[PDB]
Amino acid sequence: VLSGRDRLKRHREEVAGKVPIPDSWGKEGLLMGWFDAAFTSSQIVSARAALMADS
Amino acid sequence: DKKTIVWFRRDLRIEDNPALAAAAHEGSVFPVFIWCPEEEGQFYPGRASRWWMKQSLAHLSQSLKALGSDLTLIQTHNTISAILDCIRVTGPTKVVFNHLYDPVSLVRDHTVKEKLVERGISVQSYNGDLLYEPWEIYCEKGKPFTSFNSYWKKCLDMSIESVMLPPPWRLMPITAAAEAIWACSIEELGLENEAEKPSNALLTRAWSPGWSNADKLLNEFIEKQLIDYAKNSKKVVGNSTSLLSPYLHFGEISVRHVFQCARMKQIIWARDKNSEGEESADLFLRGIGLREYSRYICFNFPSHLRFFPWDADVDKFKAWRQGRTGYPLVDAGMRELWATGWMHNRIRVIVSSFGVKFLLLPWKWGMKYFWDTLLDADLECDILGWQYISGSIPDGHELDRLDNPALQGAKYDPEGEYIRQWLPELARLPTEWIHHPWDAPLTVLKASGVELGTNYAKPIVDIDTARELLAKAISRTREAQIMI
Ligand SMILES: Cc1cc2nc3c(=O)[nH]c(=O)nc-3n(C[C@H](O)[C@H](O)[C@H](O)COP(=O)(O)OP(=O)(O)OC[C@H]3O[C@@H](n4cnc5c(N)ncnc54)[C@H](O)[C@@H]3O)c2cc1C
Ligand SMILES: Nc1ncnc2c1ncn2[C@@H]1O[C@H](COP(=O)(O)O)[C@@H](O)[C@H]1O
Ligand SMILES: [Mg+2]
């Protein structure tokens, strides 16, 4: 049995220089579409405040 | 006696797990993992994270059986409804979990707590993931600190309020029929798509998820590697940093245990007047502190690139994704990222600012690619990282900072061994040129077997042209927001 650090070392040495990055990613079709109002909702303000109160 | 549901999310461990400890201290426990893709929305996890999570859930499942319980898995359309059904079938009177700070989880955790409370169920959440809650640190008038060094200086002038708990002797089971709550196996969660298995074969050989593998990794790092971290962490190849990030992200190792081990080594080395060791521990603890800081800025500050004239060129995106930029450190990094699901922080800095500053690619594109390929993909650490390279954060890179590859190479890969490992086409270049081969005398390129355009790509943009386009880009960003 070998450690994580040494398992990563071995794999790095096996695959380095020898693995092509695929020509297609799979999300190309989403690129042009790519919001951040996730952090400013009224709901999140209420939840932040609720979380502080319960601590 | 008392019956409590223990809702796991990003805390896939037994040691120092506060919600699990509190539930086990009160009676019998029903651990469950509830998967609701529709509720994750914009932040549904990527290929690499989902691979890791799947391995780690099976690991945790095995750990909970050996303890005399189980892990029930539910893929649902609604987290409230799945929890309400677990309560109806098992008869428990309380739900506990470790709270999270990302906007999806904050809102959902708030929605669960409000609904359970009105249905007459006790609920409590616990700090499973931080040394300092994001509201515990504030200045002299009581406001956020807005700077890492100031934030961390203030944290070291306080003590940790978090209290580590001992592990349980046994877990008293609560059993429920899989059919009465619409439960399923780990494979029925759909964490891994058929088309992903070929990519995920690389991550399988490179990593073993699971809390018991985290403990092994933390012990080997503390006991044999922390001492040299101050030096190792300044190189991007080989044995550089701890490799703890995927495990910290999934809660497979408690950050309070990381800090305790590293701080106690620091105190030992202070007594041995082993100053290099004290520096290492100090630098490593500063990394932990960046992670605390990432939660702190995402919880307290509710975007200066708003009007930046991005060049939405899907072709130069592909060239960045594939490592066909012609900048060795960048092209090595994207190869390492695809084959191992991880890269050194400085290679993360280099690769990302190359996308933004040299190519003017929209930052959301590089973030989304990171989100799909990093084992440790973590919303708050990733936000802070892109803030840092984009000048959107007090003490980070300035937006007009165009790093010179020749100097990055000399600082972070001074032997060139990072280039020689990931770009063997370049390995015969004298290390003086290997990080910017386009500046080498044609006679040196030829003696070293490098032919730009045929076996290693020509620079996809010239640095002197990139600096001009970046200065124009910044002018128009600032001209425009004054105009709007
Ligand atoms: C653009 C960019 C994007 C990033 N995206 C992620 C991500 O998705 N998930 C993630 O965990 N980290 C991210 N980071 C920071 C990341 O933790 C380091 O870049 C990387 O984790 C090194 O892994 P390690 O465990 O060996 O680091 P070590 O230095 O050995 O350990 C320090 C531990 O403390 C934390 N830490 C260390 N450095 C940082 C840092 N700069 N910022 C925040 N936390 C830190 C991490 O939990 C890390 O595992 C990003 C950095 C940048 C510049
Ligand atoms: N104030 C900070 N805010 C966010 N990230 C930081 C900050 N300082 C350092 N980092 C990270 O730490 C690394 C080391 O910074 P430096 O000492 O300037 O080279 C950087 O490349 C970032 O990834
Ligand atoms: Mg690193």
Side-chain angles (χ1 to χ4, degrees):
Chain A
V1 174
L2 45 46
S3 71
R5 190 166 262 100
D6 266 299
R7 161 189 295 263
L8 190 64
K9 188 169 102 81
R10 182 183 58 165
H11 167 94
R12 280 186 191 158
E13 297 185 330
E14 297 179 0
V15 309
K18 313 184 197 191
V19 62
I21 300 149
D23 196 78
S24 177
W25 171 27
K27 288 159 181 296
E28 278 82 341
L30 308 178
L31 285 176
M32 289 313 311
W34 290 333
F35 234 73
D36 61 309
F39 300 88
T40 41
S41 300
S42 169
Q43 281 162 295
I44 202 176
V45 172
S46 163
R48 287 201 273 250
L51 174 73
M52 286 181 254
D54 307 350
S55 301
Chain B
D1 184 41
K2 192 172 315 310
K3 301 201 276 262
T4 293
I5 295 177
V6 182
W7 174 21
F8 289 77
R9 304 96 59 83
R10 237 174 285 129
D11 50 359
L12 317 178
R13 81 172 123 105
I14 311 299
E15 187 163 33
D16 185 33
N17 179 326
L20 180 61
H25 162 269
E26 294 283 16
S28 50
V29 298
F30 184 84
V32 59
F33 178 96
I34 297 170
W35 193 237
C36 185
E38 297 164 353
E39 282 171 358
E40 307 291 334
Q42 174 176 16
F43 313 100
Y44 187 69
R47 168 181 61 80
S49 267
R50 269 182 296 97
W51 174 82
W52 184 293
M53 197 186 324
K54 181 181 187 261
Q55 308 320 311
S56 167
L57 282 171
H59 190 95
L60 175 74
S61 171
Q62 294 170 45
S63 306
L64 285 173
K65 287 155 151 56
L67 279 186
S69 197
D70 215 330
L71 184 61
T72 306
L73 313 149
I74 308 185
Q75 185 178 17
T76 183
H77 63 290
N78 189 256
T79 290
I80 315 266
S81 293
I83 290 174
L84 283 187
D85 290 308
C86 290
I87 290 175
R88 172 179 46 86
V89 184
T90 59
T93 55
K94 189 164 188 199
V95 176
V96 307
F97 51 100
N98 296 304
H99 44 248
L100 294 152
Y101 313 85
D102 64 277
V104 165
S105 298
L106 268 178
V107 174
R108 180 173 52 199
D109 294 352
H110 185 35
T111 281
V112 183
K113 281 185 305 171
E114 304 226 288
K115 170 63 84 196
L116 294 182
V117 158
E118 81 173 28
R119 288 282 218 271
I121 308 298
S122 296
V123 55
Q124 195 159 9
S125 82
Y126 299 78
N127 172 12
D129 298 301
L130 290 174
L131 302 166
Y132 306 91
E133 299 277 35
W135 54 82
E136 294 176 342
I137 301 299
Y138 45 71
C139 77
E140 230 66 73
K141 270 263 190 280
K143 203 79 175 194
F145 263 119
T146 203
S147 161
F148 176 56
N149 291 327
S150 325
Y151 171 83
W152 199 233
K153 207 194 141 206
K154 208 293 165 296
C155 289
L156 306 181
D157 284 355
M158 274 153 58
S159 13
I160 309 328
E161 316 266 334
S162 324
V163 76
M164 281 122 285
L165 288 124
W169 283 114
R170 195 118 186 102
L171 292 186
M172 298 289 72
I174 304 171
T175 40
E179 322 90 49
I181 49 174
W182 300 91
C184 66
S185 60
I186 294 176
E187 192 108 357
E188 291 161 330
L189 288 185
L191 300 180
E192 194 182 14
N193 307 123
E194 256 307 296
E196 289 157 345
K197 285 177 182 191
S199 321
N200 295 348
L202 276 34
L203 314 158
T204 305
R205 305 180 218 121
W207 298 89
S208 318
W211 67 262
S212 82
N213 295 302
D215 276 314
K216 283 191 263 298
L217 180 93
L218 172 68
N219 173 74
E220 178 264 356
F221 167 80
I222 293 312
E223 291 308 324
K224 288 253 87 186
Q225 227 64 72
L226 180 59
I227 190 91
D228 304 322
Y229 174 93
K231 268 179 193 145
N232 295 333
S233 77
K234 309 268 176 51
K235 64 196 56 161
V236 303
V237 63
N239 168 38
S240 55
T241 60
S242 72
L243 297 174
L244 283 165
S245 49
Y247 299 103
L248 283 157
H249 165 85
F250 284 104
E252 282 170 22
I253 187 76
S254 164
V255 74
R256 270 94 61 174
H257 275 53
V258 173
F259 152 90
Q260 168 129 9
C261 289
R263 174 62 184 150
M264 287 312 296
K265 282 295 171 123
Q266 183 177 49
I267 288 168
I268 288 166
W269 294 332
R271 196 190 38 78
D272 314 331
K273 311 200 183 94
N274 180 347
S275 66
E276 64 220 334
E278 299 174 87
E279 200 193 358
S280 291
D282 212 79
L283 256 209
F284 171 76
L285 284 170
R286 199 160 169 289
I288 301 304
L290 284 169
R291 178 184 170 274
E292 305 288 306
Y293 184 55
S294 81
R295 273 71 176 155
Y296 173 89
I297 65 121
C298 288
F299 188 97
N300 293 293
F301 201 33
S303 111
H304 75 130
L305 303 174
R306 41 179 157 165
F307 296 158
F308 192 97
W310 308 109
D311 180 1
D313 181 352
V314 312
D315 302 306
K316 65 176 16 63
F317 173 79
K318 181 139 113 63
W320 175 78
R321 198 184 87 238
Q322 298 195 286
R324 298 183 293 109
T325 70
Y327 288 68
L329 284 167
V330 165
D331 289 347
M334 307 293 296
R335 278 160 227 247
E336 170 177 30
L337 169 59
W338 179 259
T340 75
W342 182 96
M343 25 184 194
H344 190 285
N345 169 260
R346 286 302 306 188
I347 268 15
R348 298 192 208 205
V349 168
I350 289 174
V351 147
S352 62
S353 39
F354 186 88
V356 166
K357 284 162 181 172
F358 286 78
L359 299 189
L360 305 178
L361 291 170
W363 63 278
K364 282 203 84 80
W365 292 9
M367 166 145 357
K368 288 253 75 219
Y369 186 66
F370 278 22
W371 184 259
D372 197 59
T373 60
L374 278 172
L375 296 157
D376 57 29
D378 178 295
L379 177 62
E380 304 103 316
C381 298
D382 208 71
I383 292 329
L384 178 72
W386 290 90
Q387 291 194 327
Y388 167 90
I389 62 117
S390 91
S392 182
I393 226 56
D395 261 313
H397 287 11
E398 297 224 66
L399 182 61
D400 56 329
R401 183 200 197 119
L402 210 61
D403 285 282
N404 192 277
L407 297 160
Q408 298 174 309
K411 273 193 43 161
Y412 306 119
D413 188 41
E415 279 66 76
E417 72 182 287
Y418 186 68
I419 302 312
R420 299 198 225 263
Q421 177 162 15
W422 293 98
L423 302 167
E425 319 83 286
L426 300 177
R428 285 202 300 154
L429 273 168
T431 154
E432 164 186 10
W433 302 110
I434 191 167
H435 300 107
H436 58 141
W438 58 87
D439 293 329
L442 294 164
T443 168
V444 170
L445 293 164
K446 189 173 181 64
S448 307
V450 174
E451 175 85 25
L452 301 189
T454 64
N455 73 336
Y456 185 65
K458 288 156 128 44
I460 192 193
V461 194
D462 206 61
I463 178 136
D464 293 332
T465 301
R467 183 162 34 244
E468 282 167 25
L469 298 168
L470 177 64
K472 274 52 161 298
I474 293 185
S475 283
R476 276 136 55 147
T477 306
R478 304 217 318 126
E479 278 163 340
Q481 48 196 33
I482 283 324
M483 222 190 309
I484 301 324

Short mmCIF file of all heavy atoms in Angstrom, two decimals, chain B residues 463-483:
data_model
loop_
_atom_site.label_atom_id
_atom_site.label_comp_id
_atom_site.label_asym_id
_atom_site.label_seq_id
_atom_site.Cartn_x
_atom_site.Cartn_y
_atom_site.Cartn_z
N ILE B 463 3.44 39.12 -26.18
CA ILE B 463 3.30 39.83 -24.91
C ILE B 463 3.22 41.34 -25.16
O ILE B 463 2.46 42.05 -24.50
CB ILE B 463 4.45 39.47 -23.95
CG1 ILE B 463 4.35 40.26 -22.64
CG2 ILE B 463 5.81 39.73 -24.59
CD1 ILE B 463 4.59 39.40 -21.40
N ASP B 464 3.98 41.85 -26.12
CA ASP B 464 3.96 43.30 -26.32
C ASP B 464 2.66 43.75 -26.96
O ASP B 464 2.16 44.85 -26.66
CB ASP B 464 5.18 43.74 -27.13
CG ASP B 464 6.49 43.53 -26.35
OD1 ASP B 464 6.45 43.57 -25.10
OD2 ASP B 464 7.54 43.32 -26.99
N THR B 465 2.06 42.91 -27.80
CA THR B 465 0.73 43.23 -28.30
C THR B 465 -0.33 43.06 -27.21
O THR B 465 -1.26 43.86 -27.11
CB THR B 465 0.42 42.33 -29.49
OG1 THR B 465 1.41 42.54 -30.51
CG2 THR B 465 -0.96 42.65 -30.03
N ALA B 466 -0.19 42.01 -26.39
CA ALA B 466 -1.13 41.78 -25.29
C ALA B 466 -1.15 42.96 -24.32
O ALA B 466 -2.22 43.36 -23.85
CB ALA B 466 -0.77 40.48 -24.57
N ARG B 467 0.02 43.52 -24.01
CA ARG B 467 0.05 44.66 -23.10
C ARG B 467 -0.70 45.85 -23.70
O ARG B 467 -1.42 46.56 -22.98
CB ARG B 467 1.49 45.04 -22.74
CG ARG B 467 1.60 46.19 -21.74
CD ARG B 467 2.97 46.27 -21.06
NE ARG B 467 4.05 45.86 -21.95
CZ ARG B 467 4.83 44.80 -21.74
NH1 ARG B 467 4.67 44.05 -20.66
NH2 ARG B 467 5.78 44.52 -22.62
N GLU B 468 -0.56 46.06 -25.00
CA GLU B 468 -1.30 47.15 -25.64
C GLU B 468 -2.80 46.90 -25.57
O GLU B 468 -3.56 47.76 -25.10
CB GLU B 468 -0.83 47.34 -27.07
CG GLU B 468 0.48 48.07 -27.17
CD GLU B 468 1.08 47.97 -28.55
OE1 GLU B 468 0.30 47.77 -29.50
OE2 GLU B 468 2.32 48.07 -28.69
N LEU B 469 -3.25 45.72 -26.01
CA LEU B 469 -4.68 45.44 -25.96
C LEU B 469 -5.21 45.51 -24.53
O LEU B 469 -6.36 45.90 -24.31
CB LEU B 469 -4.96 44.07 -26.58
CG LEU B 469 -4.55 44.03 -28.05
CD1 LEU B 469 -4.56 42.61 -28.60
CD2 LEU B 469 -5.46 44.93 -28.86
N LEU B 470 -4.38 45.16 -23.55
CA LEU B 470 -4.87 45.21 -22.18
C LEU B 470 -5.01 46.66 -21.72
O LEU B 470 -5.97 47.01 -21.03
CB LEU B 470 -3.95 44.40 -21.27
CG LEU B 470 -4.30 44.40 -19.79
CD1 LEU B 470 -5.66 43.75 -19.54
CD2 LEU B 470 -3.22 43.71 -19.00
N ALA B 471 -4.07 47.52 -22.12
CA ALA B 471 -4.19 48.93 -21.76
C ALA B 471 -5.44 49.55 -22.42
O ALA B 471 -6.20 50.26 -21.76
CB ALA B 471 -2.92 49.67 -22.15
N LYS B 472 -5.67 49.27 -23.71
CA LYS B 472 -6.92 49.68 -24.35
C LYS B 472 -8.14 49.13 -23.63
O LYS B 472 -9.10 49.86 -23.36
CB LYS B 472 -6.95 49.23 -25.81
CG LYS B 472 -6.27 50.17 -26.78
CD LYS B 472 -4.87 50.50 -26.29
CE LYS B 472 -4.01 51.05 -27.40
NZ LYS B 472 -3.82 50.07 -28.51
N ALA B 473 -8.12 47.83 -23.32
CA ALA B 473 -9.25 47.22 -22.63
C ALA B 473 -9.56 47.94 -21.32
O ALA B 473 -10.72 48.18 -21.00
CB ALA B 473 -8.99 45.74 -22.39
N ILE B 474 -8.52 48.29 -20.56
CA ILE B 474 -8.74 48.95 -19.28
C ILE B 474 -9.27 50.37 -19.48
O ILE B 474 -10.10 50.85 -18.71
CB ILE B 474 -7.46 48.95 -18.44
CG1 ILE B 474 -7.09 47.53 -18.02
CG2 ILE B 474 -7.62 49.86 -17.20
CD1 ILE B 474 -5.90 47.49 -17.10
N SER B 475 -8.76 51.07 -20.50
CA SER B 475 -9.25 52.43 -20.75
C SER B 475 -10.74 52.40 -21.02
O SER B 475 -11.50 53.20 -20.47
CB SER B 475 -8.53 53.06 -21.94
OG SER B 475 -7.25 53.50 -21.54
N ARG B 476 -11.16 51.47 -21.88
CA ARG B 476 -12.56 51.43 -22.28
C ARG B 476 -13.44 50.94 -21.14
O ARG B 476 -14.57 51.40 -21.00
CB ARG B 476 -12.70 50.57 -23.53
CG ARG B 476 -12.42 51.38 -24.78
CD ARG B 476 -11.56 50.66 -25.78
NE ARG B 476 -12.11 49.36 -26.14
CZ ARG B 476 -11.98 48.82 -27.35
NH1 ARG B 476 -11.33 49.48 -28.30
NH2 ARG B 476 -12.50 47.62 -27.60
N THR B 477 -12.93 50.04 -20.31
CA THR B 477 -13.66 49.69 -19.10
C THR B 477 -13.90 50.92 -18.24
O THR B 477 -15.00 51.12 -17.72
CB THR B 477 -12.90 48.64 -18.31
OG1 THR B 477 -12.60 47.54 -19.15
CG2 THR B 477 -13.73 48.17 -17.12
N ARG B 478 -12.88 51.75 -18.06
CA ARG B 478 -13.06 52.87 -17.15
C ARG B 478 -13.79 54.02 -17.85
O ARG B 478 -14.63 54.69 -17.24
CB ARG B 478 -11.72 53.30 -16.57
CG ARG B 478 -10.98 52.15 -15.85
CD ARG B 478 -10.22 52.59 -14.60
NE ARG B 478 -9.52 53.87 -14.79
CZ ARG B 478 -9.66 54.94 -14.00
NH1 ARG B 478 -10.45 54.89 -12.94
NH2 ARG B 478 -8.99 56.05 -14.28
N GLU B 479 -13.51 54.24 -19.13
CA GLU B 479 -14.28 55.25 -19.86
C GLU B 479 -15.77 54.91 -19.86
O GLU B 479 -16.61 55.80 -19.69
CB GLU B 479 -13.76 55.36 -21.30
CG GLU B 479 -12.53 56.25 -21.45
CD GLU B 479 -11.79 56.03 -22.77
OE1 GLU B 479 -11.99 54.97 -23.40
OE2 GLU B 479 -11.01 56.92 -23.18
N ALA B 480 -16.10 53.63 -20.01
CA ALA B 480 -17.50 53.25 -20.20
C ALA B 480 -18.30 53.41 -18.91
O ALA B 480 -19.41 53.94 -18.92
CB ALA B 480 -17.59 51.82 -20.72
N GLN B 481 -17.76 52.94 -17.79
CA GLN B 481 -18.54 53.02 -16.56
C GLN B 481 -18.71 54.45 -16.07
O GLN B 481 -19.66 54.73 -15.33
CB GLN B 481 -17.93 52.14 -15.46
CG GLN B 481 -16.44 52.28 -15.25
CD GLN B 481 -15.88 51.12 -14.43
OE1 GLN B 481 -16.36 49.99 -14.53
NE2 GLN B 481 -14.86 51.41 -13.63
N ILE B 482 -17.83 55.37 -16.49
CA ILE B 482 -18.08 56.78 -16.23
C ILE B 482 -19.23 57.27 -17.10
O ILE B 482 -20.01 58.14 -16.69
CB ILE B 482 -16.80 57.61 -16.45
CG1 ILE B 482 -15.84 57.45 -15.26
CG2 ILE B 482 -17.14 59.07 -16.74
CD1 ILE B 482 -16.54 57.33 -13.91
N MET B 483 -19.38 56.68 -18.29
CA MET B 483 -20.37 57.05 -19.29
C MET B 483 -21.74 56.45 -19.04
O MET B 483 -22.71 56.85 -19.71
CB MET B 483 -19.86 56.61 -20.66
CG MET B 483 -20.07 57.58 -21.79
SD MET B 483 -19.66 56.76 -23.34
CE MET B 483 -18.04 56.10 -22.98
#
